[PDB]
Amino acid sequence: AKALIVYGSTTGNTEYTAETIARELADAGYEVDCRDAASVEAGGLFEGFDLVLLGCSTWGDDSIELQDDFIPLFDSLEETGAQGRKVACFGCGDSSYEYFCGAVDAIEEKLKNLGAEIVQDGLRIDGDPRAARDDIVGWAHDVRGAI
Numbered sequence: 001a002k003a004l005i006v007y008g009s010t011t012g013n014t015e016y017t018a019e020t021i022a023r024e025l026a027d028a029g030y031e032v033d034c035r036d037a038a039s040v041e042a043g044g045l046f047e048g049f050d051l052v053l054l055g056c057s058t059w060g061d062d063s064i065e066l067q068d069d070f071i072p073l074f075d076s077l078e079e080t081g082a083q084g085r086k087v088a089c090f091g092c093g094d095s096s097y098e099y100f101c102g103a104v105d106a107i108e109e110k111l112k113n114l115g116a117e118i119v120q121d122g123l124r125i126d127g128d129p130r131a132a133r134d135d136i137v138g139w140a141h142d143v144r145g146a147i
């Protein structure tokens with residue numbers, strides 16, 4: 001199985017989450033490519049992957065704002081080869097805000113409307129992902145068991 005993980009992270013929390021997921025998938029035998037959204041180009045990005053995991057923190061407070069490095073990829077998701085692609089989403093946030101992990105919502109809906117197959121409900125991390133490490137591991141298992 002070949003997996004692509006693409007994350008947007010400002011303070012490193014979604015990046016930690018991405019790397020935790022990456023390690024779980026690699027340890028199970030997947031080929032894993034884990035990239036910062038700041039470094040990627042949208043066109044054809046998902047081609048050749050069995051599974052694509054998109055991670056993004058939520059910003060904005062009074063409105064939903066995607067993590068800033070992820071916005072160009074989000075605005076170009078139509079170019080990535082998402083139709084029929086097996087995908088799932090993750091991200092960090094804080095439930096004291098009105099739109100908790102709203103970026104995960106936004107990315108999931110955009111993917112669904114592009115024809116992607118959402119294989120698991122998104123991973124919505126409240127607070128420090130290091131305090132949710134076992135939820136991350138479990139979700140990574142669940143995703144492997146759903147493709």
Ligand SMILES: Cc1cc2nc3c(=O)[nH]c(=O)nc-3n(C[C@H](O)[C@H](O)[C@H](O)COP(=O)(O)O)c2cc1C
Nearest residue numbers: 009010011012013014057060061093094097100101
């Ligand atoms: C000023 C500010 C605004 C935020 N706004 C939101 C928000 O609207 N919704 C949310 O779920 N979390 C919100 N957060 C929480 C961030 O998503 C959280 O700090 C997250 O761990 C950052 O992940 P990152 O390091 O991958 O960027 C905000 C954080 C700050 C400091």
